[PDB]
Amino acid sequence: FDLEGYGAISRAMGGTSSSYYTGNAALISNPATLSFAPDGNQFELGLDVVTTDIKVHDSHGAEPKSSTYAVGAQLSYVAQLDDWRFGAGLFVSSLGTEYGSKSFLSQTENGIQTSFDNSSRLIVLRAPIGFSYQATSKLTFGASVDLVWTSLNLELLLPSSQVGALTAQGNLSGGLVPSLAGFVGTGGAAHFSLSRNSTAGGAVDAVGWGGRLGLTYKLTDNTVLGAMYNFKTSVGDLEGKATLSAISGDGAVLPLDGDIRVKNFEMPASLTLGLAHQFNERWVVAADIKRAYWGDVMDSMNVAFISQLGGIDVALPHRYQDITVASIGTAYKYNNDLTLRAGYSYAQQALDSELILPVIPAYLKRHVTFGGEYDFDKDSRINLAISFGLRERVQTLRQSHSQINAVVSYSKNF
């Protein structure tokens, strides 16, 4: 879901990654770039805090606001040995909405203000084991594999009409649907809740695996070429405790308690390629094109709620498409220890969608990165980064939202 950049310096140059040293976050990016590290053993610690700013406005002007900040982190050690760089890491990141329980999105049809809450929070934990061999002096090659652990927590309200659209498109089923239609009726609402790791398991979480591999060529003595393939993150089944709760035309509430199993939530596979010409030996420039490939694997994400009274089920086809994100970045060393970086990264999806789901914000296209490094030891470096998600006005409801992302790292060398 870090479709964009990964690393404090990769984040600082428009998410570029493939054909230059991006720190140890290249494990999550292109492990073939790790052999461009200084000698010995780089040990990195990164911190990222992300403030999001969604403003859904609706049919006849009512403001639902989400001004939440998610934070992710990073810590990794890549050790030299021969050409072989052998590192590993823990990469946590976070994303979420929290609109509260006073919005129009906390209304039934009719318009009855319920107490229910709209909110979401995902936490992925990539954790790669990776390598980087220098083959010839012109070619390096790396690969990693990550253990992954996702945790999803959700508070979602659907006005009756949306439920009806779901059964009508052949998407909803399950024996609770009859049963509880006619408690919810044409002015009611259904609600789902998935609450924090209070239960040891539960939580709604899964384990799985992801993969990576890459390369690099020095076409000039001052121009590098780079390619890497990220795999579809094969997330296991999300499982935990949920509460489906049915609300009626007057505001009555039927709380129900069962287990949800979310099948087939894929992160996408992706193929990026790029260069980094250095035409001045303190004025570097890099650029990649990434294409993220969803449009493959033609199955369906299945949300199954089972309970003592019966099951509800939602099948959402995997549909989907590419996102092509052209990104460029520069890195002028104006002096010995201080490189200064900037960039931009326009993404554009192929066949679009306008699934205005306020609890699922969509990736912003035009980001604008900035940042730089200060070596204050040459064996103890530090990097920072700031990225502006230039905002969209999407319109089905009508949304507006923007991201500011802000990173740092510390790399002490050994």
155: closest CA among 109, 115, 191?
Answer: 191
Report the alpha-carbon distance of residue 50 to residue 11 in Å, rounded.
12
Report the alpha-carbon distance of residue 286 to residue 290 in Å, rounded.
13
Residue 204's contacts (CB-CB under 8 Å, 6 or more residues apart) are 151, 152, 153, 154, 194, 238, 239, 240, 241, 242, 260, 262
Read off the tokens for 366: 């035009």
Distances in whole angstroms, Cα of residue 302 to Cα of each of 115, 242, 254, 318 = 28, 15, 24, 10
Report the alpha-carbon distance of residue 274 to residue 300 in Å, rounded.
33
Residue 407's contacts (CB-CB under 8 Å, 6 or more residues apart) are 7, 8, 11, 12, 46, 47, 48, 371, 383, 384, 385, 386
User: Exposed, middle or buried by CB within 10 Å (0-12, 13-18, 19+), for 375?
Assistant: middle
CA triplet 376, 381, 383: central angle to 5 degrees?
115
Count Cα atoms within 13 angstroms, Cβ side, for 90: 7
Distances in whole angstroms, Cα of residue 9 to Cα of each of 42, 280, 325, 344, 371 = 15, 20, 18, 14, 7
Report the alpha-carbon distance of residue 123 to residue 142 in Å, rounded.
27
Torsions phi, psi for 168 (to 5 deg): -75, -35
Given resolution (angstroms): 2.9
Report the alpha-carbon distance of residue 310 to residue 301 in Å, rounded.
20
* Full set of structural domains in the chain with CATH: 8-413 (2.40.160.60)
Cβ pair 63, 34 in contact under 8 A: no
In this structure, the chain runs to a length of 414
Cβ pair 240, 206 in contact under 8 A: no
Read off the tokens for 54: 């969604």
Strands 380-389 and 367-375: antiparallel
Q: What is the CA radius of gyration of the chain?
A: 23
Cβ pair 285, 335 in contact under 8 A: no
Residue 24's contacts (CB-CB under 8 Å, 6 or more residues apart) are 7, 34, 37, 42, 43, 44, 76, 77, 78, 87, 89, 411
